[PDB]
Amino acid sequence: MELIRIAMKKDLENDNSLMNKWATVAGLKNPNPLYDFLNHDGKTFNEFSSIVNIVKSQYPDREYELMKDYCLNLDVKTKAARSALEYADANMFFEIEDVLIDSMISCSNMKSKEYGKVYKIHRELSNSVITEFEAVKRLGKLNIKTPEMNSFSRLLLLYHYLSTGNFSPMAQLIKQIDLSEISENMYIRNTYQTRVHVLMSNIKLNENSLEECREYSKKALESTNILRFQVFSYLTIGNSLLFSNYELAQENFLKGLSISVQNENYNMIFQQALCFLNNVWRKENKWINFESDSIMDLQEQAHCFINFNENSKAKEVLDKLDLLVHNDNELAMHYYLKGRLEQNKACFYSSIEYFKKSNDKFLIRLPLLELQKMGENQKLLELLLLLEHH
Amino acid sequence: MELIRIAMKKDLENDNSLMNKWATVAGLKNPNPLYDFLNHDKTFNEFSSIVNIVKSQYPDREYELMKDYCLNLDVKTKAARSALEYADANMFFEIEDVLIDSMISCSNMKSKEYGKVYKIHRELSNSVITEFEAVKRLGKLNIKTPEMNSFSRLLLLYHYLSTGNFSPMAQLIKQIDLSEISENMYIRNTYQTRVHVLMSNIKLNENSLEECREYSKKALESTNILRFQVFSYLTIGNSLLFSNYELAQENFLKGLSISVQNENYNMIFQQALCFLNNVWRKENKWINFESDSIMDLQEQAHCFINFNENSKAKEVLDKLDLLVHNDNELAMHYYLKGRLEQNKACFYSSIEYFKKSNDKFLIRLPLLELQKMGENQKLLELLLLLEHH
Amino acid sequence: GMPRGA
Amino acid sequence: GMPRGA
């Protein structure tokens, strides 16, 4: 008897009116299946959102404890399990996702087996256990038949490109996704819809299409009750305002902190967003993480030092960063900081080069402004914006 | 009787060994079709047979002898289709346009197909139609022969070359597969020369100068047609413009020496030498002071700036402003304004339009001026690395 | 650097 | 400019 079941019946005696609301809350205006769910041992809803919307409505503070207990005592061969895989991955509940995967690979239902097999590919790719090439070759060798995993096998590449600052292939790959081909799993279709809203928001951000970036994050927020998607929607809205609206950017990041109070990784992300915001506006910056040797945290230490004419301390930090391997978008920021510290236009040109290489049309505004401030010719600046990398 | 056959018989009466001679010139495995060609009002199976004989024995009257022979052909035959390419390759537009309208009206479908897409090529190169119109017309034709599927791409390549629009050429030339032309070897061979000279120009535009020269030297080895020899020497000489003054000059003068009796080809090598001497900032005896073409006015301005006559240069450049420039011509216009004004923004517009035309060779002119004005080496590298989209 | 995520 | 052709 799942903790969700033990707790749901216990609480129904004290408050007996829940049937009418729970059936309204679970995508049934007519309460027949709830009775079935509530009493007979092992009978799932047709759609996974019925359990989800109930737990978030009656035990929101115990979502993880209950969903973990329910998900791991699930027949991996069922539709409910396949929905749960996407629930666990979307929420970044790796404890739930990884046990399901190894169970969906070993079982004898073929649909659940394909699901586990490409979610495994996504997990090894995002953990740098395999390369993009190894992932693409294994995806092709699966002979993916379901329109669920044909959508996901594209999504998992989109996540890989975003995290390694390789923005060039995103716009065309995401255009290949057609979620209308998913007709048997509505939860998966709706949570993939939110995934695409968030990925499209980032693609619009990287193209410096700032009004459309914010429209897509709005759709993402309107479309989900999943914290992870809300987190990155507010991060992306806030990032889109970095260069124009300090107060509104900060408000989105602070709203992010507010909903991340029980999650360290999400909390860290908004501190880094606010840290970058205050460096761009060259303000005193309480958000710097001095106990970190990641590229992102070291760069913001040096950025603040440079802002406040602490040039020796900044060269100390850029000396540590020199010994670290950067992706193309990270090297472009390294050169921008170098160029500020040395007032060296050649670094600002190397910065533009790697921003072009990663196809980041948003952050390139940083080296371009400095070149403007150094009196670079206006026609040259226009040429640098017009030209593209191969 | 056609003049070619009248003349061949008058010389046969006096010289009998001419038969084995004309038979080997024409590449014949045996001498039967020559006799047959002289006796019955018939064709050789390959057009090169009669061309090589006219070129071997009557080179001074090729135009007269071929204009008479071609215009007397039955437009339904492989011979007449071959004469269409011969005419267009030689730029014998008088012979060509007559064949075209004959073929377009005729009841033969192959001749009809050749005629209609050679007409598209003629109308596009005379700007009677736009590129969009040409592509639209070619698509409706439902072209079936490999020859015309190849020439449909060649006519577009010529149009890109002449309008300074070099970006599409590399991908389009690769679509040509001449090995599929199996029936008309004369067409396969003259198209092979056409592709060699076009490839030479694409490698020049990519600043791949040794491969540029190799393709032009392959064109020369493949051809006995003046027009292809002319553009091979032009392209070899252009590829040397920045490095080897004497050898560039020697290739242009070689072109002049074969162009003697042809005012259009002669003008081209004069323009080539005029540009060479301006690039090297030498006394320039090749300037056309009686021209209002953009090409010639630019070189007047270029030489004036070279010899510190900047009031005269601005007079010229003020005229050029009133003319419509394609992208490649515009890039040269900004380079000259850059030199006259010593203004880096003009040099930046120059490279912008060289990037748009995809001209990686002539872009070395504004790049070198920016180097002299002390522009950052990393900036110049970046500008060479990035592409126009 | 600037955090990004989806 | 520089003449070109093929």
Author numbering:
A (entry chain B): 1 to 390
B (entry chain A): 1 to 41, 43 to 390
C (entry chain D), D (entry chain C): 1 to 6
What text comes from the article?
This system requires the arbitrium hexapeptide to bind to its cellular receptor AimR to regulate transcription of the lysogeny negative regulator gene aimX. AimR is composed of two domains, a N-terminal domain that is responsible for DNA binding and a C-terminal domain that specifically recognizes the arbitrium peptide. The overall structure of AimR is similar to that of RRNPP family proteins.
In our previous reported structures of apo- and peptide-bound AimR, we were unable to trace the N-terminal DBD structure due to the poor electronic densities. In this study, we reoptimized the crystals and collected new datasets for AimR with or without the peptide. Finally, we traced the density of the DBD for AimR with or without the peptide. In the apo- and peptide-bound form, the AimR dimer exhibits an inverted trapezoid-like fold. The last C-terminal capping helices from two AimR molecules undergo dimerization via a network of van der Waals interactions. The distance between the two aspartic acid residues in the inner cavity, D15 of AimRA and D15 of AimRB, is approximately 125 Å in apo- or peptide-bound AimR. The C-terminal domain coordinates the arbitrium peptide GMPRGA via its four atypical TPR repeats. The arbitrium peptide enriched the low-FRET species, while the high-FRET population was reduced. In turn, the peptide inhibits AimR binding to the target DNA.
